[PDB]
mmCIF file of C-alpha atoms and ligand atoms in Angstrom:
data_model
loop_
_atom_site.group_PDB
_atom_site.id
_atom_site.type_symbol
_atom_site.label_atom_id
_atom_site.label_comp_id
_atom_site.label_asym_id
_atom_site.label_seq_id
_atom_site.Cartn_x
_atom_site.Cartn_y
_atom_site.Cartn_z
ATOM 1 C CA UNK A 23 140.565 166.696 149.747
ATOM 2 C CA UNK A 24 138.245 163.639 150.847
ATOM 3 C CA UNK A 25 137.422 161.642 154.195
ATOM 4 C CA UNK A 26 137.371 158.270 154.309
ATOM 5 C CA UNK A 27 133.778 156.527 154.855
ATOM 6 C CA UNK A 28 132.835 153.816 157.247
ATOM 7 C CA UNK A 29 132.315 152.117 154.384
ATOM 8 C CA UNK A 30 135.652 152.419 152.475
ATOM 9 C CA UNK A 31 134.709 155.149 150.253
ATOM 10 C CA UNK A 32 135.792 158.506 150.003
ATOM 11 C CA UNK A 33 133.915 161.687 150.257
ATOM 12 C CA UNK A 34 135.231 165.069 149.004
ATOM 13 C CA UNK A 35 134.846 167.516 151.906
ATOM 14 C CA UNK A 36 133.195 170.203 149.804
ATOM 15 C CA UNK A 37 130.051 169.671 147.967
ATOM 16 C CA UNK A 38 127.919 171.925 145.568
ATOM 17 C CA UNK A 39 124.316 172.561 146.589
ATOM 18 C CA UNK A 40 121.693 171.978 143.378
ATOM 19 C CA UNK A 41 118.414 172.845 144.886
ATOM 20 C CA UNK A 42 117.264 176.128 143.203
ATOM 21 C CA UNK A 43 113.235 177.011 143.758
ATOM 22 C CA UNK A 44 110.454 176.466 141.656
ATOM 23 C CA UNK A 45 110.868 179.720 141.100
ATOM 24 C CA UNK A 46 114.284 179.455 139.025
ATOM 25 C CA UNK A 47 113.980 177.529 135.729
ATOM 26 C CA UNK A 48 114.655 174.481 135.189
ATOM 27 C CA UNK A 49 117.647 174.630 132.420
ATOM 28 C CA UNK A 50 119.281 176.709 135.320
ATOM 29 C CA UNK A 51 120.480 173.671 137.229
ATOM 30 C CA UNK A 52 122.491 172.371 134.164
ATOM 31 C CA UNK A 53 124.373 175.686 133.361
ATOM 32 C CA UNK A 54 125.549 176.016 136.610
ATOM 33 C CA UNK A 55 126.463 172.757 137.534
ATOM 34 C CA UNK A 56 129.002 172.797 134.911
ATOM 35 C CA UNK A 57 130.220 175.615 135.945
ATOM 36 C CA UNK A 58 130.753 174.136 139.826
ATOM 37 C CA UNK A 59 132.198 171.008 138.059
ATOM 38 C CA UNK A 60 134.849 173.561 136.023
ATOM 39 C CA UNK A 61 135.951 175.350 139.364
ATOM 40 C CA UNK A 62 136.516 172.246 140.769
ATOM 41 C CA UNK A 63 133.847 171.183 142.488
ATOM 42 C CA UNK A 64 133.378 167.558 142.587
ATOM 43 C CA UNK A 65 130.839 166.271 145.253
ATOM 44 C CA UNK A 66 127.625 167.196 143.792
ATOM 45 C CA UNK A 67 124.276 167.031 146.215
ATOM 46 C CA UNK A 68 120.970 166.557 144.529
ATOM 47 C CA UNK A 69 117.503 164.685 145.552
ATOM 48 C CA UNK A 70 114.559 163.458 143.805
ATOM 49 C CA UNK A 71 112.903 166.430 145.991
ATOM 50 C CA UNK A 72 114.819 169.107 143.925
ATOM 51 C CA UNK A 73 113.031 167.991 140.375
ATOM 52 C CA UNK A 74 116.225 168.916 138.925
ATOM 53 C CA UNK A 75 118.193 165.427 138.743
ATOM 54 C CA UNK A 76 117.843 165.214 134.836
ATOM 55 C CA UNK A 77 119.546 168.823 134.316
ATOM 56 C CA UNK A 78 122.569 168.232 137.324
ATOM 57 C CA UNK A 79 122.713 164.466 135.531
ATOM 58 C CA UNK A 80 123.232 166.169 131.983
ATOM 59 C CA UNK A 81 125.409 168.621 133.188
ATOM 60 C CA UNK A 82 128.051 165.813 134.879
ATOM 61 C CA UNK A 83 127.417 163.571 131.709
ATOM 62 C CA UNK A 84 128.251 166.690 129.291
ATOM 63 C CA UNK A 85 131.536 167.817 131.444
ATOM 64 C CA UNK A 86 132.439 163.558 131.453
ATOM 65 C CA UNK A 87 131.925 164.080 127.491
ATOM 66 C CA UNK A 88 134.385 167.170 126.863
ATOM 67 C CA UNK A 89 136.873 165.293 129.270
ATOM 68 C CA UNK A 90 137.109 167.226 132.155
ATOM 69 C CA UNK A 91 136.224 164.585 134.701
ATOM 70 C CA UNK A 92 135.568 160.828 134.716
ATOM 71 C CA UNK A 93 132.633 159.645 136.335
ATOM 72 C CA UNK A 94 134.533 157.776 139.154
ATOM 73 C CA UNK A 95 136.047 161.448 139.583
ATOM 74 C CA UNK A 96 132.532 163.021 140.926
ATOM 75 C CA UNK A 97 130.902 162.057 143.853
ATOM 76 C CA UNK A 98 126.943 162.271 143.396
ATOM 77 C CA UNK A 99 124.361 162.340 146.088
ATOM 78 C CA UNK A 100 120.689 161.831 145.548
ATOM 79 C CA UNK A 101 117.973 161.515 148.308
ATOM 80 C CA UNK A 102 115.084 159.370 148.818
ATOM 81 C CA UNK A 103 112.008 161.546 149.341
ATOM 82 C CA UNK A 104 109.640 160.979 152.066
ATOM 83 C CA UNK A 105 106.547 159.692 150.645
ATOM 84 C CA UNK A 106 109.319 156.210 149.666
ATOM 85 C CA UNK A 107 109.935 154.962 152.606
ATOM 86 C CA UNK A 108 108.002 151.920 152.730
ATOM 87 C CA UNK A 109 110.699 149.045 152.082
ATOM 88 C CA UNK A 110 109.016 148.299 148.727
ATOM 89 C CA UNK A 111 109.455 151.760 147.440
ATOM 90 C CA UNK A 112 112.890 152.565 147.981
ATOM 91 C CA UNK A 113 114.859 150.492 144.939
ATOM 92 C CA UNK A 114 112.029 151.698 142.516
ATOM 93 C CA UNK A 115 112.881 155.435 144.206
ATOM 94 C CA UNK A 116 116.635 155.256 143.455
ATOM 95 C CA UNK A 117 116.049 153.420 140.250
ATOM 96 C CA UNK A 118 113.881 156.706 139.240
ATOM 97 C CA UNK A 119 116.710 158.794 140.651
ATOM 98 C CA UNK A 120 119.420 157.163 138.094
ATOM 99 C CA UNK A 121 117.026 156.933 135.202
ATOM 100 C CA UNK A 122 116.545 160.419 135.594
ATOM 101 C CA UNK A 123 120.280 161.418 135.773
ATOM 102 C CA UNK A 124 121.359 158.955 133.503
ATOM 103 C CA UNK A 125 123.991 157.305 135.776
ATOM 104 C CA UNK A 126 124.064 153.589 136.582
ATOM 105 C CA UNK A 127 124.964 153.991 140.109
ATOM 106 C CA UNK A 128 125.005 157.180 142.624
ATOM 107 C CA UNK A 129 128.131 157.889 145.167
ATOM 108 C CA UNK A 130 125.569 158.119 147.649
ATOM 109 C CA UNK A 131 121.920 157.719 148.441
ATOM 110 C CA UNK A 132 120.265 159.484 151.247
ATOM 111 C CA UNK A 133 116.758 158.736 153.310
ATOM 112 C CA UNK A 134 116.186 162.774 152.890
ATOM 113 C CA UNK A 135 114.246 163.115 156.257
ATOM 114 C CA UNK A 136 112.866 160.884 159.082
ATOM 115 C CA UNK A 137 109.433 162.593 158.627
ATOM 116 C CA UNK A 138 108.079 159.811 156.802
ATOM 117 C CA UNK A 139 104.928 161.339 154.217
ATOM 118 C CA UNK A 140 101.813 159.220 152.736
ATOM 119 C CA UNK A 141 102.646 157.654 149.618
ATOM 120 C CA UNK A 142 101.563 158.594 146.242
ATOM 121 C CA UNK A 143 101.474 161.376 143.944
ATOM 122 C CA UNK A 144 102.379 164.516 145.707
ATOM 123 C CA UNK A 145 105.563 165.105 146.967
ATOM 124 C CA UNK A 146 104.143 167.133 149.870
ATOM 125 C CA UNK A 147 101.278 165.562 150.742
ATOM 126 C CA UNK A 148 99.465 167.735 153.183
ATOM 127 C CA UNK A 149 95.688 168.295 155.144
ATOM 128 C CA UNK A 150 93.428 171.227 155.075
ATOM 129 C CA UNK A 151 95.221 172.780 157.886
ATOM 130 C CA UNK A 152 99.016 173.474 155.843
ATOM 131 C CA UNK A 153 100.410 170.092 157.797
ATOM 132 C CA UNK A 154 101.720 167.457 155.558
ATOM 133 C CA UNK A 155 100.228 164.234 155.862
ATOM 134 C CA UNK A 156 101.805 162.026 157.631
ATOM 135 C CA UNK A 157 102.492 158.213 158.059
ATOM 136 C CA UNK A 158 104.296 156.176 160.691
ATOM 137 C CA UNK A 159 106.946 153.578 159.660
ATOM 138 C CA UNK A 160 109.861 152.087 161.222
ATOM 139 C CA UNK A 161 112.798 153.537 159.703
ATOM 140 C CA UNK A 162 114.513 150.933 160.396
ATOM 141 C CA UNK A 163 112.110 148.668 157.593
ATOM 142 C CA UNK A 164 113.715 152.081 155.396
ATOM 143 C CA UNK A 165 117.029 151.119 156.104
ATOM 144 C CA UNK A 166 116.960 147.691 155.316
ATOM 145 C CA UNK A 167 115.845 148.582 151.823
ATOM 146 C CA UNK A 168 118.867 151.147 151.662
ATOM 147 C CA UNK A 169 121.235 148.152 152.598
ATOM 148 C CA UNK A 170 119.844 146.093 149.603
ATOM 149 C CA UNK A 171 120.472 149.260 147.198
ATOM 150 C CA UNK A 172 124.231 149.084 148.389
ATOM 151 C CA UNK A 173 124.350 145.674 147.785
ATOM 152 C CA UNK A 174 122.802 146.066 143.896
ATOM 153 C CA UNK A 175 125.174 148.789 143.356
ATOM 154 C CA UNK A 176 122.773 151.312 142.641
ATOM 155 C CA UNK A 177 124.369 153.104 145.587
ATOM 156 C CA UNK A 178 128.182 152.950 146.378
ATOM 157 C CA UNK A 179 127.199 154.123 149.927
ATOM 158 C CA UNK A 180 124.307 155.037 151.661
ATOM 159 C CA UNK A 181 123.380 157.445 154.958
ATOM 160 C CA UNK A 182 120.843 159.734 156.585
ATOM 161 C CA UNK A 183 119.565 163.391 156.283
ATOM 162 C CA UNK A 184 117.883 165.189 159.335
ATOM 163 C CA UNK A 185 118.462 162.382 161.424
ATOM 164 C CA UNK A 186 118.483 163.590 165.294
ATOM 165 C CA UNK A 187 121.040 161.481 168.014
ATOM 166 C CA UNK A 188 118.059 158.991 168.605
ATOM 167 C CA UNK A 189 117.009 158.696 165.496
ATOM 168 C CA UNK A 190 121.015 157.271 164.348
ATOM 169 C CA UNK A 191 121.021 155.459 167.411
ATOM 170 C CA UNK A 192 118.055 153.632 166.566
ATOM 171 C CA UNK A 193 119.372 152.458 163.223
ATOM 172 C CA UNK A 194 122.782 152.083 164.880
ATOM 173 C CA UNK A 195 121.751 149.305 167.329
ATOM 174 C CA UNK A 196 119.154 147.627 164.821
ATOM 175 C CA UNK A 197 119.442 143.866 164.687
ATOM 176 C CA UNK A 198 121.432 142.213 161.999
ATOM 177 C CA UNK A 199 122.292 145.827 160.830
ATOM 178 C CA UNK A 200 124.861 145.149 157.506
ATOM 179 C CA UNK A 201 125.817 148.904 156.874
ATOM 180 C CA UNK A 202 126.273 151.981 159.186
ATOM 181 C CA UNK A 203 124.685 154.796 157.557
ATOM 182 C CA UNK A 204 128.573 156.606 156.295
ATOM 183 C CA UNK A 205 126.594 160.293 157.142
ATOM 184 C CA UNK A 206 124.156 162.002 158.170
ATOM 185 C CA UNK A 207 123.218 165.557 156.206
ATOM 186 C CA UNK A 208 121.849 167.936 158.417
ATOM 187 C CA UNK A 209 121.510 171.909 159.007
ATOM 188 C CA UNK A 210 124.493 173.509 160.535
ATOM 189 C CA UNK A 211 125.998 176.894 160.446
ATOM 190 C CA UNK A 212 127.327 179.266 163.313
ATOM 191 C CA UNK A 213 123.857 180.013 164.713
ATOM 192 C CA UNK A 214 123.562 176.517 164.955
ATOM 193 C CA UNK A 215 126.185 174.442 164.797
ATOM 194 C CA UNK A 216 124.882 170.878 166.315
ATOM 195 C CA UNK A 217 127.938 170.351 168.245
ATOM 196 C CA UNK A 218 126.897 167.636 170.630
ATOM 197 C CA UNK A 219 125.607 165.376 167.250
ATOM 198 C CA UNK A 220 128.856 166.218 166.105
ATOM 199 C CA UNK A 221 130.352 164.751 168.669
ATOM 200 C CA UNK A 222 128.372 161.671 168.447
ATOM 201 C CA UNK A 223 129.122 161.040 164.826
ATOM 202 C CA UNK A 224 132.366 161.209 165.625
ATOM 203 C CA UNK A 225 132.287 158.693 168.133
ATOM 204 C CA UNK A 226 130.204 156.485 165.153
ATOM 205 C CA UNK A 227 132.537 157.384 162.460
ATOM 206 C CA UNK A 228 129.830 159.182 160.772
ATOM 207 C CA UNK A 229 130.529 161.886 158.791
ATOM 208 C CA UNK A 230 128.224 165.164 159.991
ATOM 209 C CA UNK A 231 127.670 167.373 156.199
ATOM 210 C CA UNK A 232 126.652 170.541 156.743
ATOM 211 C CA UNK A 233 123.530 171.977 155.072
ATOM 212 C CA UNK A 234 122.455 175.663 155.002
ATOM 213 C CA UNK A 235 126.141 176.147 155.734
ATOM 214 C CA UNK A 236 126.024 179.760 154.340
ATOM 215 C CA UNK A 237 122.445 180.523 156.041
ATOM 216 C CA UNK A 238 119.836 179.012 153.710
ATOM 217 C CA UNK A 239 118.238 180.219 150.667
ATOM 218 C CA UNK A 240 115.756 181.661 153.067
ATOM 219 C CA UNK A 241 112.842 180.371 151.373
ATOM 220 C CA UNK A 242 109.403 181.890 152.607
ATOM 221 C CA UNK A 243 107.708 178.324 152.852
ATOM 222 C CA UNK A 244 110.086 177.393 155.469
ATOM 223 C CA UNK A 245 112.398 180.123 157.219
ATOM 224 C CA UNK A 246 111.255 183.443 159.371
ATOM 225 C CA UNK A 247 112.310 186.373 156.950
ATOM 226 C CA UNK A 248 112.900 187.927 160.870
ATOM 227 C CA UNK A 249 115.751 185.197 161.505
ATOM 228 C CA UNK A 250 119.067 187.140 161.751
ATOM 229 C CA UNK A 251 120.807 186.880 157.666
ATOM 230 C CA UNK A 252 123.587 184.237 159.044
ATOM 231 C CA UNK A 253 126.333 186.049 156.534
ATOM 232 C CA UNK A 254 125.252 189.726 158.211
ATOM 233 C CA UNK A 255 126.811 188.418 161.136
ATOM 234 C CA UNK A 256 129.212 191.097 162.441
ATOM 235 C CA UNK A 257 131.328 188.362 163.608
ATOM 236 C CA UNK A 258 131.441 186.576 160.477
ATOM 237 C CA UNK A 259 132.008 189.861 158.634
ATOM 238 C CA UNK A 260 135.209 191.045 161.226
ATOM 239 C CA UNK A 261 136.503 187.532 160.785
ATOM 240 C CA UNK A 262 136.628 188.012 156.606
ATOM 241 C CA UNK A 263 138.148 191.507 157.085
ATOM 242 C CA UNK A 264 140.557 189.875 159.389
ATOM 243 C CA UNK A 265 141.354 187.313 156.720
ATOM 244 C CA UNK A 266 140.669 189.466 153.433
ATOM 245 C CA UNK A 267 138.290 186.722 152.293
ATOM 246 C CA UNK A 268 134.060 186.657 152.552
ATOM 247 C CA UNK A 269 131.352 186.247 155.624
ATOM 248 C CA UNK A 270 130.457 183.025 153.259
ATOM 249 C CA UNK A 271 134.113 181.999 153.209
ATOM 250 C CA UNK A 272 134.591 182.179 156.820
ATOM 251 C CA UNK A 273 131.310 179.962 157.548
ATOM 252 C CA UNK A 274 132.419 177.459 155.186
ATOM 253 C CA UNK A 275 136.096 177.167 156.603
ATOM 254 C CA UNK A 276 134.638 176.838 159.874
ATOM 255 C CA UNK A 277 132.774 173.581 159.147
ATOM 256 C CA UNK A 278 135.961 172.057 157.666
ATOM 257 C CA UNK A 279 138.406 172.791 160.496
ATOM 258 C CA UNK A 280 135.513 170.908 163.190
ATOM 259 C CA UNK A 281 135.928 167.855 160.650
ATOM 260 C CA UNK A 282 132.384 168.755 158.828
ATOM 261 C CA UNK A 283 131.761 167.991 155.691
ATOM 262 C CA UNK A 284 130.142 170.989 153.834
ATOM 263 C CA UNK A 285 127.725 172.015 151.085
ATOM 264 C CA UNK A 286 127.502 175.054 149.334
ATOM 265 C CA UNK A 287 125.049 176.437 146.995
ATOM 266 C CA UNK A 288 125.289 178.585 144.572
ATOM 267 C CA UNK A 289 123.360 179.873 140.697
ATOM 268 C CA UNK A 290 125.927 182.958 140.599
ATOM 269 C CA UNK A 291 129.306 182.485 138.796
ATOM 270 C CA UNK A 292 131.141 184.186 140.755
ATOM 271 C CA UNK A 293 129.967 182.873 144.263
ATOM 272 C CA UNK A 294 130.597 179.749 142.988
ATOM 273 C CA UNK A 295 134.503 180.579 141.918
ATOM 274 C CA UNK A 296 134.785 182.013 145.134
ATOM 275 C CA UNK A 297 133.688 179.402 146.882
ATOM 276 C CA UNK A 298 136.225 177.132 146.150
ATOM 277 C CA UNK A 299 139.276 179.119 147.933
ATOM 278 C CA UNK A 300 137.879 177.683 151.185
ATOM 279 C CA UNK A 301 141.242 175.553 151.035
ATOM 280 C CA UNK A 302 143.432 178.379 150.544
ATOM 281 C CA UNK A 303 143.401 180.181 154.754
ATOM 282 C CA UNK A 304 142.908 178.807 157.790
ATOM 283 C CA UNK A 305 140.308 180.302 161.127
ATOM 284 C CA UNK A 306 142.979 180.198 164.240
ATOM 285 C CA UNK A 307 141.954 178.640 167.457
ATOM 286 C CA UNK A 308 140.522 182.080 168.404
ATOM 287 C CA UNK A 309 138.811 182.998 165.788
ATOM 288 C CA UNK A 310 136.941 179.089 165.685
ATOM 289 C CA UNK A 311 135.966 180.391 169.198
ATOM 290 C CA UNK A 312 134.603 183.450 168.119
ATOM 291 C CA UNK A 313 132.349 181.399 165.612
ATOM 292 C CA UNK A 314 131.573 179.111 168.146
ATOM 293 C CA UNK A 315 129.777 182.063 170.256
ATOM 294 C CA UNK A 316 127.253 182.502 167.545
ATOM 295 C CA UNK A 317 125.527 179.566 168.136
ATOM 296 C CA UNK A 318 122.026 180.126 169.409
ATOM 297 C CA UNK A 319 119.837 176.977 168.409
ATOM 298 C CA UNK A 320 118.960 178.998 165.232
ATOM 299 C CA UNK A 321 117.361 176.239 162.586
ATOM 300 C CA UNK A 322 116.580 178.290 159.370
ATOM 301 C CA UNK A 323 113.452 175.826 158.314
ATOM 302 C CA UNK A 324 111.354 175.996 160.964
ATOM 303 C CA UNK A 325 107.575 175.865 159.716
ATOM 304 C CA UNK A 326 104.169 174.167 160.947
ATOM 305 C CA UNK A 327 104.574 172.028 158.147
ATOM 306 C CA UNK A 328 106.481 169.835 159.731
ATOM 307 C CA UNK A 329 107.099 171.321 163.142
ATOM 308 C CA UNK A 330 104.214 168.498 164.222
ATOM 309 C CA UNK A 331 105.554 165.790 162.164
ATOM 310 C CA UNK A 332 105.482 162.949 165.120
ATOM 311 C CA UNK A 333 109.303 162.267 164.242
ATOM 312 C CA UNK A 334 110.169 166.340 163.864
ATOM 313 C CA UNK A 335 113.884 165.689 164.732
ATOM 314 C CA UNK A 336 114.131 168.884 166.699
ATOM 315 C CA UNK A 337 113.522 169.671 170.472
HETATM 316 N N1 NAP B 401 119.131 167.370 153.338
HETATM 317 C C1 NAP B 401 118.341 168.428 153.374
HETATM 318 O O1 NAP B 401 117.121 168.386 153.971
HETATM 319 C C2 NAP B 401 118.756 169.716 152.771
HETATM 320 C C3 NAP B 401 118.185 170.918 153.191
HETATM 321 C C4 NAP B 401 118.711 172.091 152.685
HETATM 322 C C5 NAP B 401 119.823 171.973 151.888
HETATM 323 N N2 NAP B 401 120.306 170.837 151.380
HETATM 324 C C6 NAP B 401 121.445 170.796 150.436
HETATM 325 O O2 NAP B 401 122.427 171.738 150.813
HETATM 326 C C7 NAP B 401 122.611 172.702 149.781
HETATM 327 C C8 NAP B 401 123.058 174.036 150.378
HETATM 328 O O3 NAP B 401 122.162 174.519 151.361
HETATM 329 P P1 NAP B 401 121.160 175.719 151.020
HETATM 330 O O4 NAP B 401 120.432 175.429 149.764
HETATM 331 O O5 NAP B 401 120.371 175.965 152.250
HETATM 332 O O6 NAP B 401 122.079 176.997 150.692
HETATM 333 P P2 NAP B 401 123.435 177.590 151.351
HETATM 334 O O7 NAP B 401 124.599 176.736 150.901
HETATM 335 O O8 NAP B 401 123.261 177.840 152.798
HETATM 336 O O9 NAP B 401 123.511 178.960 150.536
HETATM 337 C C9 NAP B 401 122.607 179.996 150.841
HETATM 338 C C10 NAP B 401 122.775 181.111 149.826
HETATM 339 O O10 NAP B 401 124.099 181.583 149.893
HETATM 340 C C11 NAP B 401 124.379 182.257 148.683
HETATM 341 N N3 NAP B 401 125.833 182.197 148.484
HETATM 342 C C12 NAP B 401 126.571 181.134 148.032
HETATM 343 N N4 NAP B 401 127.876 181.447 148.014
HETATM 344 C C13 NAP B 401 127.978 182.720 148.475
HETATM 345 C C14 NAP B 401 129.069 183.554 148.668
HETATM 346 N N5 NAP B 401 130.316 183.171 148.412
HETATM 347 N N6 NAP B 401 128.845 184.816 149.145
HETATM 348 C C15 NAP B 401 127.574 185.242 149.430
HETATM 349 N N7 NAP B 401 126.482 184.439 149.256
HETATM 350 C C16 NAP B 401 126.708 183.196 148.780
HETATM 351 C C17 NAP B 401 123.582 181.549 147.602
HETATM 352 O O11 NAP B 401 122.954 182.483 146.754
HETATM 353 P P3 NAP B 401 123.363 182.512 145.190
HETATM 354 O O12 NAP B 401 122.860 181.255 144.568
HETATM 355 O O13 NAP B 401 122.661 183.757 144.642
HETATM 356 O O14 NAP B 401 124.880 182.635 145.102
HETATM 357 C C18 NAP B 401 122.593 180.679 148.376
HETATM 358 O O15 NAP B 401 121.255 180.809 147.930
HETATM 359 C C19 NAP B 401 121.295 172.663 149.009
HETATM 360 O O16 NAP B 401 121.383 173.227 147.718
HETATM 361 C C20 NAP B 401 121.040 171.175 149.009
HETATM 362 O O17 NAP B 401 121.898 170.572 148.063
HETATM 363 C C21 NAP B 401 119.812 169.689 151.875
#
């Protein structure tokens, strides 16, 4: 199952989540990646941020090898970090990106986050007080050096990530725009479920994907170990007992019947299995409800770090 892009490409509606922590080894990423690939997962969402594009890249090349899939049968999304977006950085970015994966074009390239980061070596650039150093550039100088990608073919299409209403608006009504970005990637599960930037991409025919769809990996550098565990929810949890299927199940369905696109990680074999029976029950208009009640303006990453970043999409 796919939506059709503003562009006139397709996007399958569920995605597999690569990022795994430093923390997890490398070779991880490649293991379990084919294993996502041999359930049947197809979209695949990576990022130069993730530093694992050379293991997810092996791991579609290897299951193209065996003949499983073809490459025009996955759909792979890489980002470009933060510390690219001056116009003249972004080809070389995405041209790192494939060299690394060893693909000659991606399904989609992302700008990973409006908070824009000084260039050069780190990837998190940041001052003596934890805050990442920043730098100010119009985004829409970013975009225009997206559009070119698309029109190399290094990118079949290209979008956003942690883009706010204003922030798509501004690239929306930029002079001689050439593309619409086809999505924008941002956080949304019940306890925050962005439903008024829904909305709007509707009205844009922009696709809304869903990150953190099952909660987040709750990763100390970024997320309150005291927020509420999204898949503890009691509602969540009635609504699987309801349907004999998972809290994580539930969540995920809920994204698709709004018309969200959603991502789901998982390193477990099973989980990942399991995931993939999102297309086999439906949420009735009641229970959607009930999900919808959850929502409390609950963003998972929610750190100094970037909480001051002078385009912080959040308010
Ligand atoms: N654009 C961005 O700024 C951005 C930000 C965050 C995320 N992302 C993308 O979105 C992906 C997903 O978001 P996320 O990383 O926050 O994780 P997530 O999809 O919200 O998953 C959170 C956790 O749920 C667990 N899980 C998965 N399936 C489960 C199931 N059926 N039952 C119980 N638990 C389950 C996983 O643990 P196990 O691995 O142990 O199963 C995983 O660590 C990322 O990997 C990345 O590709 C993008």
């Amino acid at each position: 199952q796919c939506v059709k892009l503003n562009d006139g490409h397709f996007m399958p509606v569920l995605g597999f989540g690569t990022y795994a922590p430093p923390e997890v080894p490398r070779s991880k990423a490649l293991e379990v990646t084919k294993l996502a690939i041999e359930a049947g997962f197809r979209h695949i969402d990576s990022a130069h941020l993730y530093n694992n594009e050379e293991q997810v890249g092996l791991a579609i090349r290897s299951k193209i090898a065996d003949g499983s899939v073809k490459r025009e049968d996955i759909f792979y999304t890489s980002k470009l970090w933060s510390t690219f977006h001056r116009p003249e950085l972004v080809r070389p970015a995405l041209e790192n990106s494939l060299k690394k994966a060893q693909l000659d074009y991606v399904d989609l390239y992302l700008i990973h986050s409006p908070m824009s980061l000084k260039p050069g070596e780190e990837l998190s650039p940041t001052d003596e007080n934890g805050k990442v150093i920043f730098d100010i550039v119009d985004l829409c100088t970013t975009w225009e050096a997206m559009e070119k990608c698309k029109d190399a073919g290094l990118a079949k299409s290209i979008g956003v990530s942690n883009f706010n209403r204003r922030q798509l608006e501004m690239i929306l009504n930029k002079p001689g725009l050439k593309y619409k970005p086809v999505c924008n990637q941002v956080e949304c599960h019940p306890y925050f479920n962005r439903s008024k930037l829904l909305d709007f991409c509707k009205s844009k025919d922009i696709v809304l994907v869903a990150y953190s769809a099952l909660g987040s990996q709750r990763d100390k550098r970024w997320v309150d170990p005291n927020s509420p565990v999204l898949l503890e929810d009691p509602v969540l949890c009635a609504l699987a007992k309801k349907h004999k299927r998972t809290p994580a199940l539930i969540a995920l369905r809920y994204q698709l019947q709004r018309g969200v696109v959603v991502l789901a990680k998982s390193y477990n074999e099973q989980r990942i299995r399991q995931n993939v029976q999102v297309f086999e029950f439906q949420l009735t208009a009641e229970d959607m409800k009930a999900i919808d009640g959850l929502d409390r303006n609950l963003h998972y990453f929610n750190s100094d770090s970037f909480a001051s970043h002078p385009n912080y999409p959040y308010s």
